[PDB]
Design a protein around this motif. Structure first.
Motif, PDB file in Angstrom:
ATOM      1  N   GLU A 256      -8.602 -26.572  18.724  1.00  0.00           N
ATOM      2  CA  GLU A 256      -7.144 -26.633  18.672  1.00  0.00           C
ATOM      3  C   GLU A 256      -6.601 -25.760  17.547  1.00  0.00           C
ATOM      4  O   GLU A 256      -5.609 -25.039  17.726  1.00  0.00           O
ATOM      5  N   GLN A 257      -7.239 -25.813  16.377  1.00  0.00           N
ATOM      6  CA  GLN A 257      -6.747 -25.034  15.244  1.00  0.00           C
ATOM      7  C   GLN A 257      -6.872 -23.534  15.506  1.00  0.00           C
ATOM      8  O   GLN A 257      -5.979 -22.756  15.145  1.00  0.00           O
ATOM      9  N   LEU A 258      -7.973 -23.105  16.130  1.00  0.00           N
ATOM     10  CA  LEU A 258      -8.119 -21.689  16.468  1.00  0.00           C
ATOM     11  C   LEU A 258      -7.049 -21.249  17.463  1.00  0.00           C
ATOM     12  O   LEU A 258      -6.452 -20.166  17.322  1.00  0.00           O
TER      13      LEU A 258
ATOM     14  N   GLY B  44     -14.743 -26.071   9.273  1.00  0.00           N
ATOM     15  CA  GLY B  44     -13.388 -26.570   9.442  1.00  0.00           C
ATOM     16  C   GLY B  44     -12.524 -26.316   8.221  1.00  0.00           C
ATOM     17  O   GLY B  44     -11.365 -25.903   8.341  1.00  0.00           O
ATOM     18  N   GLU B  45     -13.073 -26.557   7.028  1.00  0.00           N
ATOM     19  CA  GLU B  45     -12.314 -26.256   5.814  1.00  0.00           C
ATOM     20  C   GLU B  45     -11.978 -24.769   5.734  1.00  0.00           C
ATOM     21  O   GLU B  45     -10.841 -24.386   5.402  1.00  0.00           O
ATOM     22  N   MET B  46     -12.956 -23.912   6.044  1.00  0.00           N
ATOM     23  CA  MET B  46     -12.705 -22.475   6.022  1.00  0.00           C
ATOM     24  C   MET B  46     -11.585 -22.100   6.986  1.00  0.00           C
ATOM     25  O   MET B  46     -10.709 -21.291   6.655  1.00  0.00           O
ATOM     26  N   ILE B  47     -11.595 -22.685   8.184  1.00  0.00           N
ATOM     27  CA  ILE B  47     -10.582 -22.355   9.181  1.00  0.00           C
ATOM     28  C   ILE B  47      -9.206 -22.840   8.733  1.00  0.00           C
ATOM     29  O   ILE B  47      -8.185 -22.202   9.019  1.00  0.00           O
TER      30      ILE B  47
ATOM     31  N   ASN C  27      -3.466 -18.925   5.164  1.00  0.00           N
ATOM     32  CA  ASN C  27      -3.256 -17.523   4.815  1.00  0.00           C
ATOM     33  C   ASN C  27      -2.477 -16.795   5.905  1.00  0.00           C
ATOM     34  O   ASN C  27      -1.568 -16.006   5.610  1.00  0.00           O
ATOM     35  N   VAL C  28      -2.818 -17.046   7.172  1.00  0.00           N
ATOM     36  CA  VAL C  28      -2.133 -16.367   8.269  1.00  0.00           C
ATOM     37  C   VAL C  28      -0.656 -16.743   8.291  1.00  0.00           C
ATOM     38  O   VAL C  28       0.217 -15.888   8.502  1.00  0.00           O
TER      39      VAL C  28
END
Lengths: 78, 68
Positions: free
Chosen positions: A50-52, B37-40, B46-47
């Motif tokens: 979902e986050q991606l 998950g933390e990295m994402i 940032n995005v």
């Protein structure tokens, strides 16, 4: 007349077990723990997907904005 | 006789070994998934900041050049 005859009795060998109750219980416990870990991994993976998907839209929007701004600036410059 | 006894005694340890290996793999999987998950999450932050700044900068420069 010393001619004797006999009859037979039977005994049943123990059925296949008495080793299926010590490794078995440990096997079941480990299987349960692995199932719980798999469920947790499922949940985390769905959240990451979902986050991606959320990231994708912002990525596309920034790309479009920068391209349009660059084209406009070039057009005005010349 | 002893053939089946040895067969039953030899068909249990391998399951334990395989299950333990699966356990270790799954644990490592969980840890690395948490890290990813933390990295994402940082990636998304940032995005978002970058896109907001892009909108602000483009609007500002467009209005400035329009007004001259």
């Amino acid at each position: 007349d010393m001619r004797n005859e006999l009859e037979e009795m039977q005994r049943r060998a123990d059925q296949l077990a008495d080793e299926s109750l010590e490794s078995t219980r440990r096997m079941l416990q480990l299987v349960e723990e692995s199932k719980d870990a798999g469920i947790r991994t499922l949940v985390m993976l769905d959240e990451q997907g979902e986050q991606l998907e959320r990231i994708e839209e912002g990525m596309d929007q920034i790309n479009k904005d920068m391209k349009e701004a660059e084209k406009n600036l070039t057009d005005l410059g010349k | 006789a002893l053939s089946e006894i040895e067969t039953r005694h030899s068909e249990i340890i391998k399951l334990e070994n395989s299950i333990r290996e699966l356990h270790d793999m799954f644990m490592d999987m969980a840890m690395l998934v948490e890290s990813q998950g933390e990295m994402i999450d940082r990636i998304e932050y940032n995005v978002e900041h970058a896109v907001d700044y892009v909108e602000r900068a483009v609007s500002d420069t467009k209005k400035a050049v329009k007004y001259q």
